[PDB]
GROMACS .gro file of C-alpha atoms in nm:
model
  121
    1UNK     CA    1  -8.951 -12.783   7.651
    2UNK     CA    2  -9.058 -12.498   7.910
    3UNK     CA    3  -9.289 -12.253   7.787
    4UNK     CA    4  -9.263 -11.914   8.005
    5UNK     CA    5  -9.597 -11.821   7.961
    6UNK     CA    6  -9.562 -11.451   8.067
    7UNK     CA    7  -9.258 -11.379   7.852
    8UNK     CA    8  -9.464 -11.164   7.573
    9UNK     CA    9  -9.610 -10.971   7.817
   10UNK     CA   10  -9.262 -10.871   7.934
   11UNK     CA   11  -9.160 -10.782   7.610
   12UNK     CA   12  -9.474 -10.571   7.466
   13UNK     CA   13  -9.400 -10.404   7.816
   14UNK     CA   14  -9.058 -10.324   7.727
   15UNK     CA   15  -9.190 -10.237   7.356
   16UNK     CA   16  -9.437  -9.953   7.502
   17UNK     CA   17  -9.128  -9.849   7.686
   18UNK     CA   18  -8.907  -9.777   7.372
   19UNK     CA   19  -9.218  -9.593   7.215
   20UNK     CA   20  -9.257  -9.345   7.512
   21UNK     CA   21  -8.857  -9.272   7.473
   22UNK     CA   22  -8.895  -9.235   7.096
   23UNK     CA   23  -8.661  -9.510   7.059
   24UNK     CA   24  -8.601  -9.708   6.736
   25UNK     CA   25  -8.956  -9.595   6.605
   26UNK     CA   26  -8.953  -9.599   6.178
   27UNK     CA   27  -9.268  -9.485   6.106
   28UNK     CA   28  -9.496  -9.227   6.142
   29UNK     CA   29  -9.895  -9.250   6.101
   30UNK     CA   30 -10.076  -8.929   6.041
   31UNK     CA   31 -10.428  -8.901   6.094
   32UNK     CA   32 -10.627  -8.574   6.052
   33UNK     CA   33 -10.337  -8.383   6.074
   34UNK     CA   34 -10.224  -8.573   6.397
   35UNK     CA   35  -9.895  -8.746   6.382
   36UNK     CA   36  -9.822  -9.091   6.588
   37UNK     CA   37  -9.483  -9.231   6.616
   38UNK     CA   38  -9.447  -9.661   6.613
   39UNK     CA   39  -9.259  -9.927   6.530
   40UNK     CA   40  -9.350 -10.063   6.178
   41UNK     CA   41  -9.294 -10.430   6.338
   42UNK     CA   42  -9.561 -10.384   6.630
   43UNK     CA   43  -9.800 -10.214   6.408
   44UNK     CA   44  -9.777 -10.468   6.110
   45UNK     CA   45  -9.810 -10.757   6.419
   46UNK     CA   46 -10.137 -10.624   6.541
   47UNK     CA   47 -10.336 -10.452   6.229
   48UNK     CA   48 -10.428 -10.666   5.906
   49UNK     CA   49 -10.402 -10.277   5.722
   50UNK     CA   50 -10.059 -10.229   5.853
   51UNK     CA   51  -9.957 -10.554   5.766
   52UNK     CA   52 -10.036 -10.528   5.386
   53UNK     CA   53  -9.935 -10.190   5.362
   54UNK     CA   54  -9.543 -10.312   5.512
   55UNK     CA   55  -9.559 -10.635   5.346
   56UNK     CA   56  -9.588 -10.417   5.012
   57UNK     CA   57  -9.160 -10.401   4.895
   58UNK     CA   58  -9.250 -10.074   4.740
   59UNK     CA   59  -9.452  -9.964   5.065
   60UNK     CA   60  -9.216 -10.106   5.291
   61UNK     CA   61  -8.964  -9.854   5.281
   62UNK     CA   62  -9.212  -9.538   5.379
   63UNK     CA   63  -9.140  -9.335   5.711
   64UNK     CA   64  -9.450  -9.129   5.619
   65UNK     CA   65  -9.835  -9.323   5.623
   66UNK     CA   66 -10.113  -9.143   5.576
   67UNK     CA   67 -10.434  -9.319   5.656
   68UNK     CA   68 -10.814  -9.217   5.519
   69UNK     CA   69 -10.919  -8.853   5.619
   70UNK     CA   70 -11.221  -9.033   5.781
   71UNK     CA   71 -11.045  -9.197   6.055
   72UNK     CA   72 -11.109  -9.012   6.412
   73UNK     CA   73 -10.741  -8.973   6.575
   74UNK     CA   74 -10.907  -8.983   6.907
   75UNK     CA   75 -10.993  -9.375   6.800
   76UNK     CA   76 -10.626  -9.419   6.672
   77UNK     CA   77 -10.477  -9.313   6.968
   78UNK     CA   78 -10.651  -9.564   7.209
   79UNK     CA   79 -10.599  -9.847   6.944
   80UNK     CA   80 -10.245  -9.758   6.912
   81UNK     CA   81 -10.242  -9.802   7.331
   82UNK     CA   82 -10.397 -10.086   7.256
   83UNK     CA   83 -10.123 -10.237   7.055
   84UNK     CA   84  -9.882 -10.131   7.276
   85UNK     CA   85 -10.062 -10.253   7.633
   86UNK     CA   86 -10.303 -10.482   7.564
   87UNK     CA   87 -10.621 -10.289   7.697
   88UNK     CA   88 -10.827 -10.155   7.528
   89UNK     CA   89 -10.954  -9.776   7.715
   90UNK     CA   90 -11.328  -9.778   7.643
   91UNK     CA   91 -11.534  -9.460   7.746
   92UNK     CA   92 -11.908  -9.436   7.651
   93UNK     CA   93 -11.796  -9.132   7.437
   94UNK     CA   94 -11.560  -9.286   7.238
   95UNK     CA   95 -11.665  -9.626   7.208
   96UNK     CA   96 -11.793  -9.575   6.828
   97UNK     CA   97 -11.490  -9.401   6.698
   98UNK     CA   98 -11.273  -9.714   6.832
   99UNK     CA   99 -11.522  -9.966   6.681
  100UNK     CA  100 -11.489  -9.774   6.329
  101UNK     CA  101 -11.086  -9.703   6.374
  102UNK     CA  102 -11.074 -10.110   6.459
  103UNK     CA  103 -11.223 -10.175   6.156
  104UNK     CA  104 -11.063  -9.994   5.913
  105UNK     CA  105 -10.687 -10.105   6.148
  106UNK     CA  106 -10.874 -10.463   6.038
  107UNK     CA  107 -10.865 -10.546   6.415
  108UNK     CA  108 -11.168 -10.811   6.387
  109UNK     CA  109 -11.172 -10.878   6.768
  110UNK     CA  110 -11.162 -10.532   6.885
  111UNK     CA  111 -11.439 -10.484   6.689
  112UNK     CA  112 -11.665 -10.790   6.816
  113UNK     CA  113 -11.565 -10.627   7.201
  114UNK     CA  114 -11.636 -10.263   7.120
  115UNK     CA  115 -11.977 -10.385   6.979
  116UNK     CA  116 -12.100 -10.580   7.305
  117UNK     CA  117 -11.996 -10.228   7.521
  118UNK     CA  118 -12.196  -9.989   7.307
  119UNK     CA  119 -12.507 -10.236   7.322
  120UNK     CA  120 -12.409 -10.305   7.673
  121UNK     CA  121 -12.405  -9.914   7.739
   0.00000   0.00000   0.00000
């Protein structure tokens, strides 16, 4: 009947809340030796990779994912901001390494956006 059209906003607030406190996070995501604490939930909502990783039952139950040795951390930590927020912090110096974290994250639209500001720049 009434659609509150603002409500997930709210609530992805309120998420990016509990992951500043520390609060109820289950995982943590290393990436060149940085660490990253999330909620398995939000990250499996908003990366394809996350998704198959914690839709795995054996996979699942890790606290612990490491991801490729490739992957900048610098790009993981503005998509993980990303996932948390909603926008997406794009500097001309570290536009490439969130294109190339995107899609590896399998983040198709951040991608496609990231592209248009590096030809754009």
């Amino acid at each position: 009947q009434i659609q509150f059209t603002r409500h997930a906003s709210d609530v992805l607030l309120n998420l990016n809340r509990l992951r500043s406190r520390d609060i109820l996070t289950d995982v943590v995501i290393v990436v060149s030796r940085e660490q990253f604490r999330a909620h398995k939930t939000v990250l499996m909502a908003c990366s394809g990779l996350f998704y198959s990783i914690f839709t795995d039952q054996l996979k699942r139950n890790l606290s612990v994912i490491n991801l490729d040795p490739e992957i900048n951390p610098e790009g993981f930590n503005i998509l993980l901001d990303f996932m948390y927020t909603s926008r997406l912090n794009l500097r001309e110096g570290n536009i490439m390494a969130v294109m190339a974290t995107a899609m590896y994250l399998q983040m198709e639209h951040v991608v496609d956006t990231a592209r248009k500001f590096i030809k754009a720049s």
